Design a protein around this ligand. Structure first.
Ligand SMILES: NC(=[NH2+])c1ccc2[nH]c(-c3cc([C@@H](CC(=O)[O-])C(=O)[O-])cc(-c4ccccc4F)c3[O-])nc2c1
Ligand SMILES: [Ca+2]
Ligand SMILES: [Cl-]
Length: 223
């Protein structure tokens, strides 16, 4: 997160860190055994880390659970990043409490102007790499589809939306990938891609979760 603030320990209880010996992507807990992340964050050997604040210190509240299976959307296109969503099933269910809680899936898609909370342990520099120890947060609005397509002509599909600031300075970045975009308590997006981080007129592009609720529900129900 570039231009964000320190969230405060466990104030984002649904945030998870996907770890393979180091933090590589974020994710969201949607029930006690499933996490939603981005398809491009897929790899084998993933350990899901819940209740984290400082990812380099065991401070208490952490629960490290291995992933039993990762299900990348069947129509994921690694070249366009269209359908950049993945479900991870945990080996054991997590103990939910105030520090570890799931977030609700939406019933409707959000409108432009909706203010959302984006969080993660991704890079904090737009020019260079600085990775934080604790979780960073950024409040950002969903942009209109016309502004989004104007910024990324020919690269936005109906399964994507832009959120952020066209002036640059505040954005999500590499490492935040897979994590949550929550608006009015519902998970509306997944950090997917963007051109650099916090560059003028190049907002972040997110996977539009409201277009995948039936898929998520059907897939969880059959696995
Ligand atoms: N501007 C934004 N709002 C934004 C949002 C998500 C991003 N995710 C990434 C991202 C970038 C990389 C670099 C890799 C490098 O320079 O070392 C790249 O390929 O350009 C990699 C990943 C990535 C790829 C696979 C797994 C985990 C990852 F974070 C990104 O998500 N950039 C991002 C930028
Ligand atoms: Ca920790
Ligand atoms: Cl277009």
């Amino acid at each position: 997160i570039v231009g964000g603030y320190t969230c405060g320990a466990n104030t984002v209880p649904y945030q998870v860190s996907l770890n393979s010996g180091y933090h590589f992507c974020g994710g969201s807990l949607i029930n006690s055994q499933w996490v939603v992340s981005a398809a491009h964050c897929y790899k084998s050997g993933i350990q899901v880390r819940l209740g984290e604040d400082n990812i380099n210190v065991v401070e208490g509240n952490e629960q490290f659970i291995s992933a039993s299976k990762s299900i990348v959307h069947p129509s994921y296109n690694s070249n366009t990043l269209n359908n950049d969503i993945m479900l991870i099933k945990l080996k054991s269910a997590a103990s939910l409490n105030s520090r570890v809680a799931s977030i609700s899936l939406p019933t409707s898609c959000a409108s432009a102007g909706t203010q959302c909370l984006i969080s993660g342990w991704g890079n904090t520099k737009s020019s260079g790499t600085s990775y934080p120890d604790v979780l960073k947060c950024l409040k950002a609005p969903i942009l209109s589809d016309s502004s989004c397509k104007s910024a990324y002509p020919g690269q936005i599909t109906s399964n994507m939306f832009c959120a952020g600031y066209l002036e640059g300075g505040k954005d999500s970045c590499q490492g935040d990938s897979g994590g949550p975009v929550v608006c009015s308590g519902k998970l509306q997006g997944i950090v997917s891609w963007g051109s650099g981080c916090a560059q003028k007129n190049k907002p972040g592009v997110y996977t539009k979760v409201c277009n995948y609720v039936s898929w998520i529900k059907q897939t969880i129900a059959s696995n």
